[PDB]
């Protein structure tokens, strides 16, 4: 039956990149499993040890792989007891595995190892290992396993509350090439995130945008749903409203409602509505950590309030602004607006004794400097997109040789004939 | 046909409710009976959520089985006595019958295979017209864009200007079915000269649409030129008493009233389908225009002048302009301290710049997106 | 902003064509590897 | 083309029969060449010269416009040829003018011509003061 | 009616006239080009999904 | 590759709302977007434009 | 390990073997181009004579009337049959060799040419109202007679 | 084994260097030449040729033209022939004995 | 923060943490501060009970000030961070000052007292002298206004050219 594929997957045991292909179908090789089918590996094979292991649960280059099949078997079987214990025995063996090809195989392994895990002994005792061989493999120069492991420990720091440790972690990190775009986006995701929590937004949008690009599609939804959640947040904090065509894309539109209820709060610049909404959806926003990002917006909302009150009025008595923004005192106002001015938002001045804001003009109509930068930046993008496509596109290249000898001879003959004539 | 009206009334029943349980619903059902329809009855019941009389459904399906049986049989007799141009016709009655039975896929396939025949033009073209017709009926989109391209070719080759006009009526109505009113302007506005395609709706309805969209997306001197001075409208625009009253109110600087008729017609759009939720886009815009048109002759004017004109309170008026100013959709700016409003003219560049960048970004996002795909 | 841009489109289109040649190529080669 | 030779296509006249070919080379000097280099050089006051702007604008407005009509051409060729081969291709493109070499070639002028003009100004403003 | 491009100031009883002539053609053709391209991209991708 | 993606998705979450969304999983898009916002304003305005002016009639 | 793993660090350098890999092709491609324009002297080799095949025969040699001159019975190219060669079709004749260089595509047909010269409106039914009974009769006398002569 | 292999590889590292740096050379000297072969062939055009009207093109780099002398041949078209401009019957520049389309 | 229930209790926590955050504000280290927020991310954390003092204290100066100053008065339910108060207080005023310098050139002295939260009239010109503000009989000038200069002449052609050059490299190097 289906175990043939497991044997066919073993036909990928020849050498090198076969494993890659071997893994691909093996991704879906876990569709069918039986405990008796487990005995298949018992018949497939050290051998005695393997058999013993199989019994407990319920060539080497494929030994690690069949251990993968054991993990997959257990984890997917819900049973954590044997699954958990097995990992400790399987993870160790495969880990210390004095093989280079095995590192690639173990990544799928580590990907599960952390996963099922719960706490300290897993966050802490299991983390010390991931960093250990992380260094080992780092010297072993296996790109894939490295990147994966790095991602796992990052995800650990963020299951924890420690952004700094992960940040300075990045500071000493160099990431490698040859990757899997999914892992690549896992990285860019975590990166963008911690990069954001530290307040620096404008570089977070970058890494998360890449997390959108480099991510695959098929059905990899929840990652997109989640990220976007962070995407919308960053776009919002940075002060740039996202377009509706965002809150309505796919099945995720049912989870983005909170953020779709934030922008309606933010764009309007009405604080009370905002706050009320935060109370409304708070619990919903806590299931991820986007919350404490969102609670920062109280600044941005008010910025918006001020900027709108400015564009729509040439001069306003402080009284009225304080009424539109619901705030307690005028004295509060001119602190807020005095602040807005310094930030290059309003371009006004304030008449204090009469207490009304009076507002700057668009003499800055055709700045010319603005559009230029935007234009310049764009051009570099088109170029790169044209350079990368010329360096990649540039790769059935063979079977070359015009001219000829047979024909040449014929030509010569013809010439000779002509001469004779 | 299939008669659109079924669909329009269906949408009517959907409405914000409104229930009712009035003319509409029983109008529909009444045209289920005489139409022995089915694919609705489950489709509609599952949508509206109000099924009953499992017997009626069975009767309708039965008679349907009878006639589909019959047409199938007729076709069988042709296969032995073809009758090329004939066979295709019995098919046209087949898929057509799927239209009376309002089943999409079926008439679809039926028609298609009839194209492999068809051969002529009215069959290979007009049949397509009906195929898309279904599109209009279901509230689809692409299903049409791909067929209006087909007919487009069939007309570009030869044909005449009689089919091209219906065609522009369909394309136009479609354009209205989206936010694309500009394209519908010229299309529909030019559809007044000829309109044999009563298939969809009557003439005065159409009239109200072409006048609506015209008022919306035409310039002031070309409004006066192509609509206010519409030989085909004067006789019709006298037949009505709503849109026209608004159209005139604008053109002639009689604002304050313009508003009332505007609200009226708005309350008449949410009822239609071609607009559905566009009733919110239309009025928004029709607010701006007037505000725009009112200022254009002033470098400064006082609120109370405006509010007085339109006949609303200041505070509400200010509150309205505040919507349009920050978006640079209106070249005003306000001074509330003195209750005054001055107008800052815009620069051509400022317009395109904002538009160019927006467009460029849309193309960039699409370029990159699919870039990565083809890259991997 | 137009020249550079549209030009990039032209490279992109060309890249697409290349991927077409490769895809078709491996299909026929791997085909032949049968016999 | 040059030929030097002495007695005893061309074989019709007995290249080798009545006469025979020789070989040729050229005595040179590092200067000679140096004169010749300036052959396809420019002028002096050149490099700082800024062609009539207004007139230039027409190239970008007129050039871009001409391209616009092409933009659709490229669209129609991709949506069409999208479903064909190269032999069928020769029938299409030996006939008419594919808009591919037009957009790429057309962009060439706008690119460099604009960059030179943009660059020239950048220097005249700062330099000449 | 867009005849002469100016504006009335009723405060001072004045009439201003302007000399408009900025609606630039270049930028217009550039925007139009973006439209034709935005159609070509879609059609280009319509072949990619098929070749990929 | 798809499997890898799926795995990544799984790691990032599960999820609660995401699962529900998936279960729910249509429609179109029309052309362009922004900004929707609230509704029932225009007539509301007129309802008030009356009332306003009616209040101003009351004025 | 010390020097052991060392070999790996440099062993992976094989990456440079591929890029150059991209080079060769990338480089070999030019060589064809630069060399391709060298055989341009080929254009000088000679010319090609289109011809009008009268018909083929036995003994192996196509019977042909070229163009200005007249009929020649001449051998074919080895790359074509005698059988794949029909009557009324263009084919590259080796100019001086007066053997088939290759067989050009299409011939143009004569009956089609006659029909073109006549130019008799290509009319589809759906455009003649008031001509059914006839049509029926016509169908009876033509369409039916052909569709199913078995009737 | 290393002192024979780990050391015998350094050569290799240079092989890619010996060739990696030279490889660019062929790319570079080819491009300059690329302009030569294109220009050098200019002679093909000459000056005293025999105008012909274009007829049909069998396919890529070929076609049948008419000779003003009454000949009508399958001839070869120079890579330069800015094709696009090849309606259905052009007055055409013909090489004489190479007899091909200039 | 270590796994335990009897280990993390001491209310010296609740006061101490808040004290720490407030320290971070006092030193104007915002990075460290928000990093700490992400750390503490105490899920089962109602509103912020005591901890709203430093948080809220931060959010409001993300903008307004009057609300913040109010927080300064509300720490006296608190500890020696009063000293920090006297830090933060000054740390705010310069801001307003540094704000109002560019805001508008003209203030009546009583209004400066209104802004900077003085309970004294003389503390004003104390501060303004310390700020070097020329004062005219209760009415201060902050001139110059602005030097809307740099009409582009150094990075307009010297940068773009290289840009151009680059761009053209971007065009050239593209090979």
From Swiss-Prot, chain A:
Protein origin, superkingdom: Eukaryota
Keywords on record: Isopeptide bond, Phosphoprotein, Proteasome, Ubl conjugation
Molecular-function GO terms, alphabetical: enzyme regulator activity
UniProt-annotated stretches for the region Disordered: 396-421
Listed SUPFAM superfamilies: Winged helix' DNA-binding domain
Domain PCI: 185-364
Location of Phosphoserine modifications: 317, 329
Any one GO biological process: proteasome-mediated ubiquitin-dependent protein catabolic process
Pfam families with a match to the protein in the record: PCI (PF01399), Rpn3_C (PF08375)
InterPro entries per record: 26S_Psome_reg_C, CSN3, PCI_dom, TPR-like_helical_dom_sf, WH_DNA-bd_sf
Biased composition annotated in UniProt, kind: Basic and acidic residues: 397-421
One GO term describing the cellular component: proteasome regulatory particle, lid subcomplex
Family: Belongs to the proteasome subunit S3 family.
Function: Component of the 26S proteasome, a multiprotein complex involved in the ATP-dependent degradation of ubiquitinated proteins. This complex plays a key role in the maintenance of protein homeostasis by removing misfolded or damaged proteins, which could impair cellular functions, and by removing proteins whose functions are no longer required. Therefore, the proteasome participates in numerous cellular processes, including cell cycle progression, apoptosis, or DNA damage repair.
Name of protein: 26S proteasome non-ATPase regulatory subunit 3
Species in which this protein is naturally found: Homo sapiens (Human)
Curated annotation (Swiss-Prot), chain F:
Function: Component of the 26S proteasome, a multiprotein complex involved in the ATP-dependent degradation of ubiquitinated proteins. This complex plays a key role in the maintenance of protein homeostasis by removing misfolded or damaged proteins, which could impair cellular functions, and by removing proteins whose functions are no longer required. Therefore, the proteasome participates in numerous cellular processes, including cell cycle progression, apoptosis, or DNA damage repair.
Keywords: Nucleus, Proteasome
Any Gene Ontology biological process: proteasome-mediated ubiquitin-dependent protein catabolic process
Tissues and organs where the protein is expressed, per its UniProt entry: Expressed in limb bud, craniofacial primordia and skin.
Gene Ontology, cellular component aspect: cytosol; integrator complex; nucleoplasm; proteasome complex; proteasome regulatory particle, lid subcomplex; protein-containing complex
Transmembrane segments: none
Subcellular location: Nucleus
Lipid metabolism is among the record's keywords: no
Assigned protein family: Belongs to the DSS1/SEM1 family.
Protein name, as recorded: 26S proteasome complex subunit SEM1
CDD domains, per the entry: DSS1_Sem1
Main location, first listed in the record: nucleus
Swiss-Prot record, chain G:
Residues of the full protein shown: 24 to 174 of 406
Lineage start: Eukaryota, Metazoa, Chordata, Craniata, Vertebrata
Phenotype upon changing residue 37 to Q: In a colorectal cancer sample; somatic mutation
Recorded superkingdom: Eukaryota
List of residues that carry Phosphoserine: 97
Function per UniProt: Component of the 26S proteasome, a multiprotein complex involved in the ATP-dependent degradation of ubiquitinated proteins. This complex plays a key role in the maintenance of protein homeostasis by removing misfolded or damaged proteins, which could impair cellular functions, and by removing proteins whose functions are no longer required. Therefore, the proteasome participates in numerous cellular processes, including cell cycle progression, apoptosis, or DNA damage repair.
UniProt family annotation: Belongs to the AAA ATPase family.
Disulfide cysteine pairs (residue numbers): none
Complex formation: Component of the 19S proteasome regulatory particle complex. The 26S proteasome consists of a 20S core particle (CP) and two 19S regulatory subunits (RP). The regulatory particle is made of a lid composed of 9 subunits, a base containing 6 ATPases including PSMC5 and few additional components. Component of a complex with USP49 and RUVBL1. Interacts with PRPF19. Interacts with TRIM5. Interacts with NDC80. Interacts with PAAF1. Interacts, in vitro, with the thyroid hormone receptor (in a thyroid hormone T3-dependent manner) and with retinoid X receptor (RXR). Interacts with ERCC6.
Transmembrane segments: none
Subcellular location: Cytoplasm; Nucleus
UniProtKB/Swiss-Prot annotation, chain I:
Functional description taken from the UniProt entry: Component of the 26S proteasome, a multiprotein complex involved in the ATP-dependent degradation of ubiquitinated proteins. This complex plays a key role in the maintenance of protein homeostasis by removing misfolded or damaged proteins, which could impair cellular functions, and by removing proteins whose functions are no longer required. Therefore, the proteasome participates in numerous cellular processes, including cell cycle progression, apoptosis, or DNA damage repair.
Cellular component terms per the entry's GO annotation: cytosol; nucleoplasm; nucleus; proteasome accessory complex; proteasome complex; proteasome regulatory particle; proteasome regulatory particle, lid subcomplex
Coverage span on the entire protein: 176 to 350 of 350
Coiled coil regions, renumbered to chain: none
Protein family: Belongs to the proteasome subunit S14 family.
Keyword Cytoplasm: no
Subunit note: Component of the 19S proteasome regulatory particle complex. The 26S proteasome consists of a 20S core particle (CP) and two 19S regulatory subunits (RP). The regulatory particle is made of a lid composed of 9 subunits including PSMD8, a base containing 6 ATPases and few additional components. Interacts with DDI2. Interacts with TASOR.
Name of the encoding gene: PSMD8
Signal peptide: none
A biological process term (GO) from this entry: proteasome-mediated ubiquitin-dependent protein catabolic process
Domain PCI: 1-156
Top-rank taxon, per record: Eukaryota
Cross-link Glycyl lysine isopeptide (Lys-Gly) (interchain with G-Cter in SUMO2) per UniProt, renumbered positions: 122
Keywords per UniProt: Isopeptide bond, Phosphoprotein, Proteasome, Ubl conjugation
Name listed for the protein in its UniProt record: 26S proteasome non-ATPase regulatory subunit 8
Stretches that traverse the bilayer: none
